[PDB]
Design an enzyme around this catalytic site. Sequence first.
Site, mmCIF file in Angstrom:
data_model
loop_
_atom_site.group_PDB
_atom_site.id
_atom_site.type_symbol
_atom_site.label_atom_id
_atom_site.label_comp_id
_atom_site.label_asym_id
_atom_site.label_seq_id
_atom_site.Cartn_x
_atom_site.Cartn_y
_atom_site.Cartn_z
ATOM 1 N N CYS A 14 11.349 30.629 -1.343
ATOM 2 C CA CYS A 14 9.993 29.985 -0.768
ATOM 3 C C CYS A 14 9.386 31.187 0.192
ATOM 4 O O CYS A 14 8.192 31.881 -0.087
ATOM 5 C CB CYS A 14 10.389 28.867 0.281
ATOM 6 S SG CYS A 14 11.900 29.314 1.268
ATOM 7 N N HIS A 68 11.992 35.109 -2.813
ATOM 8 C CA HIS A 68 10.744 34.402 -2.433
ATOM 9 C C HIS A 68 9.322 34.093 -3.234
ATOM 10 O O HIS A 68 9.546 34.800 -4.258
ATOM 11 C CB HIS A 68 10.283 35.608 -1.259
ATOM 12 C CG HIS A 68 9.960 36.970 -1.997
ATOM 13 N ND1 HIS A 68 10.655 37.418 -3.160
ATOM 14 C CD2 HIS A 68 8.778 37.666 -1.903
ATOM 15 C CE1 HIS A 68 9.928 38.463 -3.403
ATOM 16 N NE2 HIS A 68 9.020 38.874 -2.518
#
Length: 147
Positions: free
Chosen positions: A122, A65
């Site tokens: 992401c 992430h």
Amino acid sequence: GSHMSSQTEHKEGEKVAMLNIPKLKKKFSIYWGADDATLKKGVGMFVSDVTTTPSGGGHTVLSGHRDTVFTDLGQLKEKDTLVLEYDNKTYTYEIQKIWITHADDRTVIIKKEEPILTLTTCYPFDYIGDAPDRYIIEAKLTGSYSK
């Protein structure tokens, strides 16, 4: 019936390989599987009938992430390389092409007859859960080491 626990065989949520970056001199712990349900772990390896670990020619997928921006400039580049440590062996990868695809892109989570490392991440603060468009970093194995 979860009183019993196992720790020795390849199990999801367990450290199996380590990700090291030479250009960015950054290191990250890669654990088998990538459970998004729990935020306990940080980086996990995709596990599927098509996805496998980098132990000698195979489709390697990385899941992570994005939090803040620091060395992202050096991260996205064909000059960058990704070093993976597995079974006391170090695999040297190189960024070939960087792009963005949907979280439902199985084409990037399929099987590979070659040692290819694909990083998908992401999960931005703006979006909760699995962001619609995930960043994809494709890399190929150029060199390998074994001790």
